[PDB]
Structure 1
Amino acid sequence: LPITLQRGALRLEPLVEADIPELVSLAEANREALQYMDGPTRPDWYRQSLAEQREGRALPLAVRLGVQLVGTTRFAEFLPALPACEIGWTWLDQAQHGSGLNRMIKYLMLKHAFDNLRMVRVQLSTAASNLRAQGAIDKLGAQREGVLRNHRRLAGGRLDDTFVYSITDHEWPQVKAALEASF
Structure 2
Amino acid sequence: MWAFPERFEGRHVRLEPLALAHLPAFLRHYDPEVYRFLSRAPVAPTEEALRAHLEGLLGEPGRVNWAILFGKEVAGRISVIAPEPEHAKLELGTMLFKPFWGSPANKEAKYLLLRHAFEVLRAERVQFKVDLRNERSQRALEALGAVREGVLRKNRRLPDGAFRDDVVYSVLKEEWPGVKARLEARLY
Q: Using structure 2 for the length normalisation, give the TM-score.
A: 0.84
1:137 Cα deviation from its structure 2 partner: 0.9
The runs of at least 4 consecutive aligned structure 1 residues that moved more than 3 Å come to 153-158
**Structure 1, unaligned runs of 5 or more:** none
1:138 Cα deviation from its structure 2 partner: 0.7
Q: Does 1:142 align with 2:146?
A: yes
Indicate the residue corresponding to 1:45 in structure 2.
Answer: 53
Question: Could you give the per-residue CA deviations for residues 130-164 of structure 1, whole angstroms, max 9, x where no partner exists?
Answer: 00010111111000112101112468763210000
Q: Does 1:36 align with 2:37?
A: yes
Aligned positions of 1:1-183 closer than 5 A: 1-3=3-5, 4-8=7-11, 10-23=13-26, 25-28=27-30, 30-41=31-42, 42-52=50-60, 57-88=62-93, 90-153=94-157, 158-182=162-186, 183=188
SS at match of 1:81: helix
1:95 Cα deviation from its structure 2 partner: 1.6
165-174 vs 148-157, which deviates more? 148-157
Aligned counterparts of 2:148 and 2:179: Cα–Cα separation in 1: 15
1:21 Cα deviation from its structure 2 partner: 4.4
1:117 Cα deviation from its structure 2 partner: 1.3
Q: Which amino acid aligns with 1:116?
A: V
SS at match of 2:75: strand
Maintained 8 Å contact 2:75/2:105: no
Cα distance change, pair 96–14 in 1 and its aligned pair in 2 (3 A): same
RMSD of aligned C-alpha atoms? 2.0
Maintained 8 Å contact 2:153/2:164: yes
Percent identical residues: 36
Aligned length: 177
Cα distance change, pair 9–98 in 1 and its aligned pair in 2 (3 A): closer
Cα distance change, pair 157–35 in 1 and its aligned pair in 2 (3 A): farther
Question: Could you give the per-residue CA deviations for residues 152-177 of structure 1, whole angstroms, max 9, x where no partner exists?
Answer: 24687632100001000111111112
Cα distance change, pair 150–111 in 1 and its aligned pair in 2 (3 A): same
Aligned counterparts of 2:4 and 2:182: Cα–Cα separation in 1: 27
Maintained 8 Å contact 1:60/1:75: yes
